[PDB]
């Protein structure tokens, strides 16, 4: 949002970036002092500290320092050290805040007169920024809002320097008007370019020598970090004085900043017994309120929220933080954890609850020890599944968990937990003809809209096309009841607009980074009359520019940071209302007579539930969004509702802060608003009078008492608005109003018609275990679904930790066994000897031919591999099979030799072209020797070597070759390594595991050749005709 920065951070950026003709004096002359300051180091970096007299003051967001005697003026460095001796590290009380004086700033003393002190301030508002100037600056400036010269720089307007001179610098000394004008002009551009929301210089000192910035008080638009990170640097946002920050708060802040989700946490009382983990910014407040109202104010430990669809992991990281924090010390009455929320629109409840359940399992020991009782109440996408997992973790751990759904009133679990109650501009925006373009790839949102449309009995779908810049133009499949339809997806918005002139609404799912530009672009297509901006986190400044353009172009903006709205029977903005089951539950397929407006998207979904149960239903509902300046405000929509004949009553869900809600009082008074209005402003707490101490002179005044929810609620009730006792009475008062209106004939409720039926989604039915569908596939080698990859039961980390190697991994994937080390080493050895055997072989030849014919690696490799099997590469398998058969049949080696001769068969794995009994094959030597050394038993190898004794006695080159050696050795390894049964070993041979060895092994050689030919830049091959014998038929 807009966060306060230190006087040092401010002066740094100022000195660094302010561009002016005015000579700014003492640039970068400033030194920071803490209790850990090395004075020798400080003096090394700031030699100017000895050059002149100094001024020392604390840099801890302490206002009115001078008046508190916290400013040591005109001192030598020795005098500064003497001044700090009693102050540095000391506790200090500034108003109702008590903290330590840890951070100080030293600056050179500026000799000047009181006449030479000035006041400048710039601050943003919805209409542009105000520049204030006063010629009586100093610690005695007073009410600067009334006293000073105001000037508004409009939204996309430039600060004209003639206007500065003309109006701001009216009472400034004539001789200093040009320098002041030059500085103010430059300051305004610096304020703009660095995304400040507030920047105040008091005093600004202008002497015969030049301009001096003696004090800074500035707030930046923290959300604008993505732009300014480069200029801002490692910008730190200090917590207000007295408040001492916690490491847990800093952690959650980091998670929030690095994601599109909202994760907030603030500790109230670390030693409190009431802990809350509520979903949604609206609900969080309402729960905090209910606890305060039931006396738990002093026992309330925190105020936080999680929303914007966080991942299971993010929810886990959030939950573990809360659980860690509540299990630090024991309470005599135990503790409470309120896991609440309203009915969600898009936050997947099944998914988020799995994260929380994981954190509860990890902290089950401390949670039982600290006697923690959990109360859950949540609705929304797949809430059914998420509630089941909650009940189940309570049973399996022993922790008491009480789980409730949409049927329970939101705030009912608070009284349950505390033991008070038992545990059981355009008026019309949308029509039934409205067609929209969805910017972004949001399949679930689009389908959601289309299911709402079908049940509303719409003749056509509300989504005409989608815009997604990363893919080329294509069509996406969707469901119109049970009929499949295609929706076009465009790379360019220009094309979408051109092909779809019927579209007048744009739903913008662009990210905060992409959002501004995409909206601005849409405004160039006049057909678009309403834009819904979903993104939460757009810098305030960029939104003001979107408001300015939309206002001048007549386009209605719903958002930013909104879920949207819903017009039952007509149109629903993206995810508003959530899944069909909620649309049906809250009877949103047909209209009622009640119209509502809310800031919170989550509370909007709770309002649909409340209104449906108490009245004839919702006519139209809008969530205006939560950003500082919304595109459309409460009044904008209240007036639309007042002017819509179908609306018979209006419900407004207000909030603490702002004065928007007072425009309604005014409207009623003026007689503009005649329809009955029901209103509740949330945030009746701050009973803990934190009373955020005013940032500087400019803001400091107004009336922060009127802004409060308690004040607004009183004001509105007196105004004639129907205001409930508390949020828990809101249903009763809405029902009370509706009953009077039906009684007075203002409302004539219509008979109920059943909506068109849509089939359940398979995904969903399977989740609830309602249907069973047999799997078509069966696997047993690898599981990629887990946290970790699993190879045949062994997780990948264990594979490396146990040093398995390629051989080891092959054992798991091919045999699903943890093989002995010798076995693995042997497999690796096989793969090495079979790697290559020159380019003359059938396979290598094809791969080379292929590579030479300009093909890719995979084509070239496959072309070669496809020759492996029979006459080429077959021998390994063949030999193993042949010898196994013979051995197992019980025939002696000589009987075998003769059997083969008689059958007219040659022995597989016997014979060599050159190698003989006197000239051995090295590959066979290497392998024989490894096997002899490391294999416990080698009976088949022994048998084969005896056959070799017989064949070599015939012809000397009839040696056991490498294919035969590997064959028999492999059989001996399977049978005698002790990992396989006889059946298992025999099946593996038969199914061709041995072929796999040769194929995998030789694959290396083939890739080798492919690369080689490419590297050798070898041209296309054509076989010479002279090598071809053409024997064609006679004509």
Ligand X SMILES: CC(C)(COP(=O)(O)OP(=O)(O)OC[C@H]1O[C@@H](n2cnc3c(N)ncnc32)[C@H](O)[C@@H]1OP(=O)(O)O)[C@@H](O)C(=O)NCCC(=O)NCCS
Ligand Y SMILES: Nc1ncnc2c1ncn2[C@@H]1O[C@H](COP(=O)(O)OP(=O)(O)O)[C@@H](O)[C@H]1O
Ligand Z SMILES: O=P([O-])(O)O
2 CB-side CA count, 13 A = 18
Determine the residue with CB nearest Mg ion.
307
- The catalytically annotated residue of 697, 845, 912, 1023 is 697
Q: Is 500 a catalytic residue?
A: no
What is the DSSP code (8-state) at residue 149? B
DSSP assignment of 186-213:
HHHHHHHHTTEEEEEEEEEEEETTEEEE
1004 binds a second copy (CB under 8 A): yes
Cβ neighbours for 817, distance < 8 A, ≥ 6 positions apart? 792, 811, 979, 980
Q: Which two tokens stand for residue 499?
A: 């092909």
The answer to whether the annotation marks 347 as part of a ligand binding site is yes
55 binds ligand Y (CB under 6 A): yes
| DSSP E strand boundaries for 308-408 | 335-339, 372-377, 401-404
Stretch of 150-158, 382-390, 720-728, 1010-1018 lying at the interface with a second copy (CB under 8 A): 1010-1018
The angle at the Cα of 400, spanning 398 to 406, to the nearest 5 degrees, equals 130
C-beta separation of 309 from 381 below 8 A = no
Query: Closest Cα partner for 602 from 347, 313, 831?
Result: 347
Stretch of 39-47, 62-70, 75-83, 522-530 lying at the interface with ligand Y (CB under 6 A): 62-70
The answer to whether the annotation marks 363 as part of a ligand binding site is yes
- The single residue among 576, 600, 834, 961 that binds ligand Z, judged by CB under 6 A, is 600
Q: Which two tokens stand for residue 1022?
A: 């054509």
Min dist CB 609 to ligand Y, Å, is 50
Element (H, E) at 506: strand 505-508
- The single residue among 199, 455, 741, 861 that binds a second copy, judged by CB under 8 A, is 861
Give the Cα separation of 221 and 195 in Å (integer): 6
Residue with token string 């979904």: 605
Q: Interaction with ligand Z in 306-345: which residues (CB under 6 A)?
A: 307
Quick one: 222 or 429, whose CB is closer to a second copy? 222
Stretch of 23-31, 304-312, 390-398, 541-549 lying at the interface with ligand X (CB under 6 A): 304-312
Query: Closest Cα partner for 348 from 387, 314, 380?
Result: 380
The answer to whether the annotation marks 308 as part of a ligand binding site is yes
Quick one: 684 or 1013, whose CB is closer to ligand Z? 684
Q: Which two tokens stand for residue 527?
A: 């057909």
Min dist CB 97 to a second copy, Å, is 34
Min dist CB 360 to a second copy, Å, is 18
Q: Which does 55 bind (CB under 5 to 8 A by kind): a second copy, ligand Y, ligand X, none?
A: ligand Y
Cβ neighbours for 411, distance < 8 A, ≥ 6 positions apart? 286, 287, 290, 727, 728
Element (H, E) at 129: strand 128-134
Q: Interaction with ligand X in 562-591: which residues (CB under 6 A)?
A: 562-563
The answer to whether the annotation marks 930 as part of a ligand binding site is no
Give the Cα separation of 345 and 342 in Å (integer): 10
Provide the 3-class DSSP secondary structure of residue 91. strand
Give the Cα separation of 428 and 505 in Å (integer): 12
Quick one: 282 or 864, whose CB is closer to ligand Z? 282
Min dist CB 516 to ligand X, Å, is 11
Give the Cα separation of 465 and 475 in Å (integer): 9
- The single residue among 215, 256, 627, 655 that binds Mg ion, judged by CB under 5 A, is 215
The answer to whether the annotation marks 473 as part of a ligand binding site is no
Encoded one letter per residue, x for contact with Mg ion by CB under 5 A and - for no contact, window 303-322 reads: ----x---------------
Quick one: 601 or 864, whose CB is closer to ligand X? 601
Cβ neighbours for 366, distance < 8 A, ≥ 6 positions apart? 323, 327
116 binds ligand Y (CB under 6 A): no
DSSP assignment of 604-626:
HHHHHHHHHHHSS-EEEEEE--S
Min dist CB 172 to ligand Y, Å, is 18
The maximal CA–CA distance of the chain, rounded, in angstroms, is 126
Q: Interaction with ligand Z in 274-303: which residues (CB under 6 A)?
A: 280-282
Min dist CB 321 to ligand X, Å, is 20
Q: Interaction with Mg ion in 848-867: which residues (CB under 5 A)?
A: none
Environment class of 872 (CB within 10 Å of its CB; exposed 0-12, middle 13-18, buried 19+)? middle
Environment class of 76 (CB within 10 Å of its CB; exposed 0-12, middle 13-18, buried 19+)? middle
Q: Interaction with ligand X in 906-925: which residues (CB under 6 A)?
A: 906-907, 910-911
Give the Cα separation of 526 and 546 in Å (integer): 15
Environment class of 1012 (CB within 10 Å of its CB; exposed 0-12, middle 13-18, buried 19+)? middle
Residue 475, beta-bridge partner list: 488
Q: Which does 800 bind (CB under 5 to 8 A by kind): a second copy, ligand Y, ligand X, none?
A: a second copy
For ligand Y (CB under 6 A), the number of binding residues is 17
Q: Which does 65 bind (CB under 5 to 8 A by kind): Mg ion, ligand Y, ligand X, none?
A: ligand Y
Please, after which residues is the chain broken with C–N above 2.5 Å? 424
Instruction: Tell me the backbone φ, ψ of residue 760, rounded to 5 degrees.
Output: -70, 150
Stretch of 72-80, 431-439, 622-630, 1017-1025 lying at the interface with a second copy (CB under 8 A): 1017-1025
Quick one: 109 or 814, whose CB is closer to ligand Y? 109
Give the Cα separation of 939 and 972 in Å (integer): 7
Min dist CB 589 to a second copy, Å, is 23
Instruction: Tell me the backbone φ, ψ of residue 993, rounded to 5 degrees.
Output: -55, -35
Q: Which two tokens stand for residue 559?
A: 């958002």
Give the Cα separation of 500 and 493 in Å (integer): 10
115 binds ligand Y (CB under 6 A): no
The angle at the Cα of 138, spanning 132 to 141, to the nearest 5 degrees, equals 60
C-beta separation of 304 from 284 below 8 A = yes
601 binds ligand X (CB under 6 A): yes
Element (H, E) at 128: strand 128-134
The answer to whether the annotation marks 182 as part of a ligand binding site is no
The answer to whether the annotation marks 721 as part of a ligand binding site is yes
Stretch of 59-67, 222-230, 659-667, 969-977 lying at the interface with ligand Y (CB under 6 A): 59-67
Q: Interaction with ligand Y in 412-471: which residues (CB under 6 A)?
A: none
Min dist CB 582 to ligand Z, Å, is 15
517 binds a second copy (CB under 8 A): no
The answer to whether the annotation marks 532 as part of a ligand binding site is no
Q: Give alpha helix (H) positions in 141-271.
A: 144-147, 161-163, 177-193, 225-232, 247-257
537 binds ligand Z (CB under 6 A): no
Give the Cα separation of 344 and 338 in Å (integer): 17
Encoded one letter per residue, x for contact with ligand Y by CB under 6 A and - for no contact, window 127-156 reads: -----------xx-----------------
The angle at the Cα of 645, spanning 640 to 646, to the nearest 5 degrees, equals 100
Quick one: 574 or 626, whose CB is closer to ligand Z? 626
The answer to whether the annotation marks 716 as part of a ligand binding site is yes
535 binds ligand X (CB under 6 A): yes
Min dist CB 358 to a second copy, Å, is 11
Min dist CB 534 to ligand Z, Å, is 11
Q: Which does 987 bind (CB under 5 to 8 A by kind): ligand X, ligand Z, a second copy, none?
A: a second copy
Stretch of 336-344, 423-431, 806-814, 903-911 lying at the interface with ligand X (CB under 6 A): 903-911
Q: Which does 1009 bind (CB under 5 to 8 A by kind): a second copy, ligand Y, ligand Z, none?
A: a second copy
Binding residues for ATP: 57, 65-66, 108, 110, 117, 215
**Annotated binding-site positions:** 57, 65-66, 108, 110, 117, 215, 256, 259, 261, 308, 345, 347, 363, 378, 716-726
**Which residues sit at the interface with ligand Y, rule CB under 6 A?**
55, 63-67, 71, 73, 107, 109-110, 138-139, 202-203, 214-215
Q: Which residues are annotated as catalytic? A: 697
Question: Where along the sequence are the contacts to ligand X (CB under 6 A)?
Answer: 260, 262, 307-309, 509, 511, 513-514, 534-536, 561-563, 601, 901, 906-907, 910-911, 951, 954-955, 958
Residues that bind Mg ion (CB under 5 A): 202, 215, 262, 281, 307
């Amino acid at each position: 949002s807009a966060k306060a920065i230190s006087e040092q951070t401010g002066k740094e950026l100022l000195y660094k970036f302010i561009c002016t003709t005015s000579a700014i004096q003492n640039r970068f002359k400033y030194a920071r002092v803490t209790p850990d300051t090395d004075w020798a180091r400080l003096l090394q970096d700031h030699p100017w500290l000895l050059s002149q007299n100094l001024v020392v003051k604390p840099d801890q967001l302490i206002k009115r320092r001078g008046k508190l005697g916290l400013v040591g003026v005109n001192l030598t460095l020795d005098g500064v050290k003497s001044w700090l001796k009693p102050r540095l590290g000391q506790e200090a009380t500034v108003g109702k805040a008590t903290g330590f004086l840890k951070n100080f700033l030293i600056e050179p003393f500026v000799p000047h007169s009181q006449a030479e002190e000035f006041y400048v301030c710039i601050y943003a508002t919805r209409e542009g920024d105000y520049v204030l100037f006063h010629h009586e600056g100093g610690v005695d400036v007073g009410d600067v809002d009334a006293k000073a010269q105001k000037l508004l720089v409009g939204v996309d307007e430039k600060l004209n320097p003639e206007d500065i001179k003309k109006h701001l610098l009216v009472h400034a000394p004539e001789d200093k008007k040009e320098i002041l004008a030059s500085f103010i002009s430059g300051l305004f551009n610096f304020y703009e370019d660095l995304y400040f929301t507030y920047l105040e210089i008091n005093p600004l000192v202008v002497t015969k020598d030049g301009v001096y910035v003696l004090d800074l008080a500035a707030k930046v638009d923290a959300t604008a970090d993505y732009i300014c990170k480069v200029k801002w640097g490692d910008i730190e946002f200090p917590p207000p004085f007295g408040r001492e920050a916690y490491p847990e708060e800093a952690y959650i802040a980091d998670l929030d900043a690095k994601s599109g989700a909202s994760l907030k946490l603030t500790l109230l009382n670390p030693k409190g017994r009431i802990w809350t983990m509520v979903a949604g910014g609206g609900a969080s407040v309402v729960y905090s309120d209910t606890i305060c109202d039931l006396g738990g104010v002093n026992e309330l430990a925190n105020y936080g929220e999680y929303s914007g669809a966080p991942s299971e992991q993010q929810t886990y990281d959030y939950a573990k933080t809360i659980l860690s924090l509540m299990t630090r010390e024991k309470h005599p009455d135990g503790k409470i954890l309120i896991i609440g929320g309203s009915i969600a629109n898009f936050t997947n409840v099944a998914a988020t609850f799995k994260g929380i359940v994981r954190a509860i399992r990890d902290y089950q020991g401390p949670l039982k020890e600290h006697e923690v009782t959990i109360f859950v109440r949540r609705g929304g996408p797949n809430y059914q599944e998420g509630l089941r997992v909650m009940g189940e973790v309570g049973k399996t751990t022993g922790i008491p968990i009480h789980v409730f759904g949409t049927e329970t009133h939101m705030t009912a679990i608070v009284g349950m937990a505390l033991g008070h109650r038992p545990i059981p501009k355009s008026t019309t925006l949308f029509s039934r003809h409205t067609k929209a373009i969805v910017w972004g790839m949001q399949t679930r949102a689009v389908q959601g809209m289309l299911d709402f449309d079908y049940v509303c009995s719409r003749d056509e779908p509300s989504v005409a096309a989608m815009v997604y810049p990363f893919t080329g133009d294509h069509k996406q499949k969707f469901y119109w009841g049970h009929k499949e339809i295609l929706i076009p997806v465009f790379k360019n918005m220009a094309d979408a607009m051109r092909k779809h002139p019927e579209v007048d609404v744009l739903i913008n799912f662009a990210s905060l980074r992409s959002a501004y530009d995409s909206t601005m672009e849409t405004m160039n297509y006049a057909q678009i009359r309403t834009i819904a901006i979903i993104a939460e986190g757009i810098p305030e400044a960029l939104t003001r520019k979107l408001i300015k353009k939309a206002d001048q172009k007549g386009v209605t903006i719903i958002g930013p940071a909104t879920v949207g709205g819903i017009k039952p029977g007509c149109f629903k903005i993206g995810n508003t209302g959530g899944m069909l089951d909620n649309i049906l539950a809250s009877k949103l397929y047909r209209p009622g007579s009640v119209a509502y407006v809310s800031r919170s998207g989550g509370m909007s979904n709770e309002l649909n539930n409340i209104i449906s149960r108490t009245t004839d239903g919702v006519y139209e509902g809008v969530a205006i969004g939560g950003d500082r300046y919304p595109g459309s405000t409460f009044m904008d929509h209240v007036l639309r509702y007042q002017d819509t004949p179908g609306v018979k009553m209006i419900v407004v869900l207000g909030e603490i802060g702002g004065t928007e809600e007072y425009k309604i009082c005014r409207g009623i008074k003026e007689g503009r608003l005649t329809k009955p209005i029901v209103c509740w402003c949330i945030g009746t707490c701050a009973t803990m009078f934190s009373s955020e101490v005013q940032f500087g002179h400019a803001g400091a005044c107004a009336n922060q008492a009127s802004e409060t929810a308690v004040a607004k609620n009183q004001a509105l009730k007196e105004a004639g608005v129907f205001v409930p006792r508390s949020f828990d009475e809101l249903g009763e008062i809405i029902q009370s109003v509706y009953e009077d209106l039906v009684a007075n004939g203002v409302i004539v409720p219509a008979q109920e018609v059943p909506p068109p039926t849509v089939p359940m989604d398979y995904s969903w039915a399977r989740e609830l275990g309602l249907i069973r569908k047999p799997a078509s596939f069966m696997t047993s080698i690898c599981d990629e679904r887990g946290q970790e990859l699993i190879y045949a039961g062994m997780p990948i980390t264990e594979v490396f930790k146990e040093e398995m190697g390629i051989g080891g991994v092959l054992g798991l994937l091919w045999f699903q066994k943890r093989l002995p080390k010798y076995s693995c080493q042997f497999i690796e050895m096989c793969l090495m000897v079979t790697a290559d055997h020159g380019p003359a072989v059938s396979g290598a030849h094809n791969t080379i031919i292929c590579a030479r014919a300009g093909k890719d690696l995979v084509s070239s490799l496959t072309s070669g591999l496809l020759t492996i099997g029979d006459r080429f590469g077959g021998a390994l398998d063949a030999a193993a099979k042949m010898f196994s058969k013979a051995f197992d049949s019980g025939i002696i080696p000589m009987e075998f030799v003769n059997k083969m001769k008689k059958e007219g068969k040659l022995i597989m794995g016997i014979g060599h072209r050159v190698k003989s009994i006197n000239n051995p094959d090295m590959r066979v030597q290497i392998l024989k020797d490894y096997v002899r050394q490391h294999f416990p038993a080698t009976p088949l190898l022994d048998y084969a070597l005896e056959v070799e004794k017989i064949t070599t006695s015939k012809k000397p080159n009839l040696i056991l070759n490498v294919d035969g050696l590997i064959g028999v050795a492999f059989v001996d390894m399977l049978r005698n390594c002790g990992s396989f049964t006889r059946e298992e070993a025999d099946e593996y041979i038969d199914i061709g595991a041995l072929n796999g060895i040769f194929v995998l092994g030789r694959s290396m050689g083939f890739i080798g050749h492919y690369l080689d030919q490419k590297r050798l830049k070898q041209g296309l091959y054509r076989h010479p005709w002279d090598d071809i014998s053409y024997v064609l038929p006679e004509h």
